[model samples]
Target: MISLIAALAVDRVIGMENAMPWNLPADLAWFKRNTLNKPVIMGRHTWESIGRPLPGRKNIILSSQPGTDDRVTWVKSVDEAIAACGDVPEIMVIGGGRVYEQFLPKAQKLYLTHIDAEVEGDTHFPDYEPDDWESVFSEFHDADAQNSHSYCFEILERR
Candidate 1:
């Protein structure tokens, strides 16, 4: 299964200057727990942001330019990455913004952490209507009683 995991603000802003603008420890831990040891794919910029391969999992970075040798598998296309993955039990589409836009249509499940606030960012996530996906599960978390600045982790399956 190909799944996408992301945390975004109400305006769909995911990052600022090629990096995540918000820090959610719970979300990070959730991501690590869910995607650990799995084949994860992302764009070249996303990999560059990390600066090194994530331990305990296979990291595939899609790049149009060739440079990386053995430390990472540099795939020039999404199909190539998928082919490389070869029907793994679960392959994750980790992202920045361009990668998410490209793979959203191909993803089967969407794991989203929606923050109830707006942020200033350069990258934005695509918005899909609820009818386009089946909301299989959701968990709401609050940072306050007024529910402002709260977040919800949502799991959506393609309809």
Candidate 2:
């Protein structure tokens, strides 16, 4: 399965200066739970923004001018990244808009955290047609002293 995991604000904002706009630890934990041990594919900019390979998963980066890194396998396209995963059941695409757009049509599932607030951002999640997908599951989380904002986790499957 090819899946996408991301958190977007109400305005569809997903990134700012290559980083997420909010600090939602719960959402981050949710992401880690789902992507753990899976081949997590991201664009060059996302990888650079993250600064290091996430400890428990295989990091695959899509880039034209790839660099040598024992921590990550660099590929030129999404297909190459998928192929590099070998027999893994699912490959997770964790991104910075452009990469998400490139893989959107190919994704079988989407794990999205719909944040309640909107904020300034340089990158935004690509808009999707509602008719192309169906919501499989959803769960809401309210903001507390720990969480910065209210958000809902939604799982959408291609229709």
Candidate 3:
């Protein structure tokens, strides 16, 4: 159950200076719901943006110059990160584009949070062919006080 999860705006914009462009509480809740109790892999940039390991899930950070952390396991490569998941059978790639690009080829499922509004960003999610994937589920979340933008959560599986 290796899955790549990401949130992107209309132009596929994902990040600006290592942080997301919008604040959507529902999207955050959706992310936590899906990845909780699973082994989630991310690159150093994403880890730095988050600043700490997410509780209730194993954080596997991919970096060449690994650092010491009992809360998170740092590895030099994707293979090592996968192995670091240990006995955990399910894994999730929670990203910045750099990390997503590496794991995209191996991931079989995707949980895409599509924001309705477009925003300025320096990073983007990797392109994927429509013929290669099938949407299994999708739902729109309305924007509110806590949510800066209305977005849709779509679940897709590789064809």
Candidate 2 residue lDDT tens string, 1-159: 899999999789998877775788999899999999898999999988989999889899999985768778999877888899889889999997999999999999999999998889999889999899999999998999889899999999999
Better of 2 and 3 by TM-score: 2
14 in model 3: Cα distance from truth in Å? 0.6
lDDT of 2 at 57: 91
- Write down the worst ten-residue block by lDDT for model 1: 142-151
Candidate 2, residue 92: the lDDT equals 94
The numbered model that scores best in TM-score is 2
Query: What is the C-alpha local distance difference test score of candidate 3?
Result: 0.90
RMSD of 1: 2.7
lDDT for each candidate structure: 0.84, 0.90, 0.90
How well does each candidate superpose onto the true structure, as a TM-score? 0.90, 0.96, 0.95
Error of 1 at 124 (Å): 0.9
Off by over 4 Å in 2: none
